[PDB]
Design a protein around this ligand. Structure first.
Ligand SMILES: [Zn+2]
Ligand SMILES: [Zn+2]
Ligand SMILES: [Zn+2]
Lengths: 95, 51
């Protein structure tokens, strides 16, 4: 393992969540684009692929192989404090 | 802006989007309990819980 690979994984996790958050929000209620992050469209394409594809371990695509893993982690993770899971589960900012 | 998105710039600075793999991700951040691959409908259901 490497700390900079963890940095890369952290942003992939957040971006993948944005892709669906953006989609969901836009469909539910919008006027001005829900989107903010440039890479969102890339993650939306990856998101679409993930649901259709069933190869997982065998899929040669970097994105597919990675994206399944990040969601698997977040879903299973019930740790006291994790650098992504914790802030996602319990958002520090509230209204 | 958004809570999850807090200083994305930190990691975004490194090229843009990396070429990570199942192996790399499994090694660096192991799935709690036992390793698996969350797939199909369950993906979208997991992504929905953010709201
Ligand atoms: Zn977006
Ligand atoms: Zn695939
Ligand atoms: Zn975790």
């Amino acid at each position: 393992a490497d700390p900079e690979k963890r940095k890369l994984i952290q942003q992939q996790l957040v971006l993948l969540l944005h892709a669906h958050k953006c989609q969901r929000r836009e469909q539910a209620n919008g006027e001005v684009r829900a989107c903010s992050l440039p890479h969102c469209r890339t993650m939306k394409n990856v998101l679409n692929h993930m649901t259709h594809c069933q190869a997982g371990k065998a899929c040669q695509v970097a994105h597919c192989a990675s994206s399944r893993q990040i969601i698997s982690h977040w879903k299973n993770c019930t740790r006291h404090d994790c650098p992504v899971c914790l802030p996602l589960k319990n958002a520090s900012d509230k209204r | 802006s958004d809570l999850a998105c807090r200083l994305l710039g930190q990691s975004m600075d490194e090229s843009g989007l990396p070429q990570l793999t199942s192996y790399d991700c499994e090694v660096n951040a192991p799935i709690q309990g036992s390793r698996n691959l969350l797939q199909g409908e369950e993906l979208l259901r997991a992504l929905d819980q953010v709201n």
